[PDB]
Amino acid sequence: LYIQWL
Amino acid sequence: LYIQWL
């Protein structure tokens, strides 16, 4: 699982 | 920007 809010 | 990989 990978989540990124950049 | 938003990246999501379940």
Question: Considering only CB atoms, which chain B residues are within 8 Å of A6?
Answer: 1-3
In chain A the first and final C-alpha atoms are separated, in Å, by: 16
Half-sphere exposure of A2 (CA within 13 A, CB side): 4
Question: Considering only CB atoms, which chain B residues are within 8 Å of A2?
Answer: 3-5
Q: What share of chain A is helix, strand, coil (3-state, %, to 5)?
A: 0, 65, 35
Name, in order, each residue with C-beta under 8 angstroms of A2's C-beta and a sequence gap of 6 or more.
Answer: B3, B4, B5
Token output for B4? 């999501």
Distance from A2 to chain B by nearest Cα, in Å? 5
Of B1, B2, B6, the CB nearest to A1: B6
The reported resolution of this PDB entry, expressed in Å, is 1.4
The one-letter code for the residue type at A1 is L
Q: At residue A4, what are phi and psi to the nearest 5 degrees? A: -140, 120
The one-letter code for the residue type at B3 is I
Q: Show the CA angle centred on residue A4, arms to residues B1 and A2, nearest 5°.
A: 135
Half-sphere exposure of A3 (CA within 13 A, CB side): 1
Q: What was the experiment behind these coordinates?
A: X-ray
